């Protein structure tokens, strides 16, 4: 008698997990690009700071000429600092999406199992 | 010079004898006779001035008054903070054209209570406007392929309107090309009535300068600097018999390119410092008793462009300074005073004040005592840069001074001692990578000046002694010269005008940059002689010659960087 009622709840549950697989797949595509850009920018910062330590012996002496290299190296560090701050904020926003979708998938999966058992009985 | 007028003391006119603080005045006459080709050379010979330069003209240079930091002298053009100091937070006159200079009023001592920030060592007011009418075509040829061509004129339009104009081109070699300077200056001053007056005033300069830069493969050599600056002053003066009013506005814009000729001035690799500076001042003075009381406001705005001064983005610093000044001579006493409070958009408010006493014990001999507090504001870099810190406080300075001035048998002399306790200095820390607010310094020195005629001879000598030290380490602040002797002998003879400027600058202490770690080294103390003649052919043509550094000495002020020895200049000027 429940030839359709069991279907309707499972046929929904299989789309429920399908639309959710797409979420987690796109979420891992956003996450990976955001880690690779953060790792890229985090190092172009690390270079800049390592360039500072290299020149900050000229730092006290604004006539030295190397001081100019230390001066400019600070800007390299600062422009990179803003870059490691945006792409970190963007990566963190993309890291929530992966944790939320990995959980939402799991919660769609186990919810569907319940309706999958509500199939062998109703039919 | 004694008993002539200055404006720098409290923004208004007063006889220089009546300014209690130690003072010096330089005239165009004074400058023309010295055949000076840079502002640094005009200052280089005034007492307490100790200058260092990375070589020839246009080269990065920094002034130390009375042993203080480069960032502790306020340099004013016509009374407003030198617009070139804006980004650096440090005065540098190697780039400011000599052709605008007409008067230098220079008062040694704390003056934050009158002018706000960075007037600790003293004040250098470089005045661009003078009251000698007529017109002068002038030229100069010198060594290091130095050339200079210069026209200036001031003329009446009516009885009430005076127009003054000058253009100046100057270029010198001595790095591969050196320093090229082009200046244009226009000013008109009107007289609405006997006491009401107003003036517009614009001047700009272009400065192409070449320098030696740190080389790194695969990266462009930013060894060329193009500087464009212009300024626009506009005023309204009421000069009455009992009250005086100054309404002054200025707008300075400056663009400072460092680039690689090969890559281009607009190429991404180039460093551009754009900085716009606005000022509105009101100044008032009211004759009260045998003296006066003054009170004005001065406001300033400094905007920068993203990138400017090695900071990511562009900042807006606004500052308002309300101030009050008193001056009163009672009997043989004299009390001078000033108060100030600057409210900065950056670090809130800060107060400042000085007070001086002048009792004349014998007619023509008196003793001056004085105390003053002066500050210095944290600069663009050390606030918003990577090393920067936005919560920095101003550098603080307590200053005390005692002096004896007197006239003895045709000689005017001064023996004076000063104490200067700069505290809360802004310093960079390696182990953290930030600018902190820590350092201190105990500066003690003596100033000994005397000028006198001996027959056809006119002597202007002065002695300075300074021992600037770190208050913590008791170790001496480096690159200062222990003591200088500045002596000039002027005696025109057979219409031949003569002047022998001498200078013994003592021992600096600089760091050596050949081996690492960088080891501090001793600089030799040396004498410097200069010879200058001027003959007047017509009541118009005056031909002047100069041999600078007669004895071809091998001095340096920045260890490593060489400064020229034997060098010659022939020049002529045509007054009509």
Swiss-Prot record, chain A:
Biased composition (Basic and acidic residues): 109-123
Entry's family note: Belongs to the colicin/pyosin nuclease family.
Protein's job: This plasmid-coded bactericidal protein is an endonuclease active on both single- and double-stranded DNA but with undefined specificity.
UniProt name for this protein: Colicin-E2
Organism of this sequence: Escherichia coli
Record lineage: Bacteria, Pseudomonadati, Pseudomonadota, Gammaproteobacteria, Enterobacterales
UniProt gene name: col
Residues of the full protein shown: 321 to 443 of 581
Swiss-Prot record, chain B:
Binding-site positions, Ca(2+) 1: 175, 177, 212
Sequence intervals crossing the membrane: 135-142, 146-155, 161-172, 179-189, 194-210, 225-239, 241-258, 271-287, 290-299, 315-331, 333-343, 347-362, 365-379, 396-405, 411-420, 435-452, 456-471, 479-491, 497-512, 520-534, 547-558, 564-576
Superkingdom, natural source: Bacteria
Span(s) of short sequence motif TonB C-terminal box: 559-576
Consequence of changing residue 5 to P: Inactivates uptake
Positions that bind cyanocob(III)alamin: 60, 62, 69, 87-88, 213, 271, 479, 513
Keyword Cytoplasm applies: no
Name of the protein in question: Vitamin B12 transporter BtuB
Name of the gene encoding the protein in the UniProt record: btuB
